[PDB]
Amino acid sequence: TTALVCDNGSGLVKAGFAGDDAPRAVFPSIVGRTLKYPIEHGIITNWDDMEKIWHHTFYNELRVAPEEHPTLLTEAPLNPKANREKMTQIMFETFNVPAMYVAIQAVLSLYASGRTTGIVLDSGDGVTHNVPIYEGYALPHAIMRLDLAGRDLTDYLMKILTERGYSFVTTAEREIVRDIKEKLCYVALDFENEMATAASSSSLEKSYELPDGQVITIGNERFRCPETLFQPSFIGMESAGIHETTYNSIMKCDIDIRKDLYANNVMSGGTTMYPGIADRMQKEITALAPSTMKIKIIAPPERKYSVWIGGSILASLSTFQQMWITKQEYDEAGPSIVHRKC
């Protein structure tokens, strides 16, 4: 009688029960044979492996029988119709869930901010999306996708620390650098100024303690790493930055709702957790938009879990109860019911 909420990400699975303020279980989306990531850039690409992960969610992490709880899952924006159907098939026929639904992650994040209209920036471990949303529906022609997120940043941080004399190379060491990224990296309001402070003084330098007790210093790397979000060619990508893509996204929208989009930039996901990221987005967006445009960036403290929380909220909504797909419905109709409904 309690709904489950399962948020499948490229790097982390967020799972728990609808009606809770936070997921009870957060764990890595990996299977080992060497580690495989069954979710690449927000999309499921190995189904056997994904089954093992959902099997782990039910029986190990949450400790519930799947056939007893309606289950709300999440999908990346622009997730192919065929992918969504396979997900539905696995849930009802492998796991015997009594009901389910598949929600778009970035919309859930918007709901968690107490909003139904806005433009979300959702940046995770494997993909970055700009998702314009009007009255609860994502506008698919205007969604932007950037294949650059936290894992790319971490690798970049491994590369640039190497040029300071450190040798971070192994996949175990990649975990240590992810940790440094999360404790020590921030977004410079102005990249040049920051490089010049760091060139001429030690005021931005931080110490980090390694597992074995050794202490190292990191400098301009702190902000050079997440700077790649605004200038992706730092790792050889031609794409525009997250500021430009927010702008391009808003511009693919009907002029009537663009003011509301600009006033409602919601940030979502672990890779939007960099201190200073909101002030830099404000400043960058300002520079591209018309002079009179009211620009607002909302960055909730709990935005590592926004998608999950939006799910918890939706699953609990009286209005949403009519939208669950029941096993009866599915076994009667066919995997198509996941259109004229979801």
Ligand X SMILES: Nc1ncnc2c1ncn2[C@@H]1O[C@H](COP(=O)(O)OP(=O)(O)NP(=O)(O)O)[C@@H](O)[C@H]1O
Ligand Y SMILES: C[N+](C)(C)CCCS(=O)(=O)O
Ligand Z SMILES: C/C1=C/C(=O)O[C@@H]2C[C@@H](CC[C@H](C)/C=C\C=C\CC1)O[C@@](O)([C@@H]1CSC(=O)N1)C2
Contact set with ligand X (CB under 6 A)? 9-12, 42, 124-127, 149-151, 178, 181-182, 269-271, 273-274, 304
Question: Under rule CB under 6 A, how many of the chain's residues touch ligand Y?
Answer: 4
Stretch that binds its own copies, among 204-212, 234-242, 297-305, 312-320 (CB under 8 A): 234-242
Closest to ligand Y by CB, 88 vs 220, is 220
Can residue 28 be called a binding residue for ligand Z (CB under 6 A)?
yes
Q: Which does 196 bind (CB under 5 to 8 A by kind): its own copies, ligand Y, ligand X, none?
A: its own copies
- Burial bucket for residue 213 (CB in 10 Å: 0-12, 13-18, 19+): exposed
The β-bridge partners of 39 are: 44
Q: How many CA atoms lie within 13 A of 307 on its CB side?
A: 30
One residue of 3, 6, 9, 312 binding Ca ion per CB under 5 A = 9
The H-or-E segment that residue 160 falls in is helix 150-162
Q: Which does 270 bind (CB under 5 to 8 A by kind): its own copies, Ca ion, ligand X, none?
A: ligand X
Closest CA to 263 of 295, 290, 292: 295
Q: Per this entry, what is the length of the chain?
A: 342
Q: Which does 151 bind (CB under 5 to 8 A by kind): ligand Z, its own copies, Ca ion, none?
A: ligand Z
Can residue 219 be called a binding residue for ligand Y (CB under 6 A)?
no
Can residue 199 be called a binding residue for its own copies (CB under 8 A)?
yes
Which of 176-179's residues contact partners 24+ apart within 8 Å by CB, and which partners?
A: 176/210, 176/211, 178/150, 178/154
One residue of 169, 210, 235, 251 binding its own copies per CB under 8 A = 235
Going by DSSP bridges, is the β-strand pair 118-123/265-268 parallel, antiparallel, or unpaired? parallel
Q: Which does 269 bind (CB under 5 to 8 A by kind): its own copies, ligand Y, ligand X, none?
A: ligand X
Can residue 311 be called a binding residue for Ca ion (CB under 5 A)?
no
Closest CA to 241 of 288, 308, 199: 288
Can residue 192 be called a binding residue for its own copies (CB under 8 A)?
yes
Q: Is the dihedral of CA 214, 215, 216, 222 positive or negative?
A: positive
Can residue 12 be called a binding residue for ligand Z (CB under 6 A)?
yes
Query: Which residues precede a break in the chain, with C-to-N distance above 2.5 Å?
Result: 33
Can residue 275 be called a binding residue for ligand Y (CB under 6 A)?
yes
Closest CA to 53 of 100, 98, 87: 87
Q: Calculate the CA 177 to chain-centre distance.
A: 19
Q: Which does 233 bind (CB under 5 to 8 A by kind): ligand Y, Ca ion, ligand X, none?
A: Ca ion
Binding site for its own copies (CB under 8 A): 191-193, 195-197, 199-201, 231, 233-236
